[PDB]
Amino acid sequence: LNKRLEQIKSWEETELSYLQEEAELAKEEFGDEFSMHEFLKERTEEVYR
Numbered sequence: 001l002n003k004r005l006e007q008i009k010s011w012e013e014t015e016l017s018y019l020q021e022e023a024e025l026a027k028e029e030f031g032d033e034f035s036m037h038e039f040l041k042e043r044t045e046e047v048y049r
Helices: 002-026 038-049
Strands: none
Touching: 002 038
């Protein structure tokens, strides 16, 4: 269980790292207006969940 939980947290911290690049990869091309903060605020806690 321990060695599994450490992989789970490493997975989570790699996904949170990928998220910063994915935010400007796939959210700034979505609308004429800029509300980038809420996209990260939502899918960060999606990664947490």
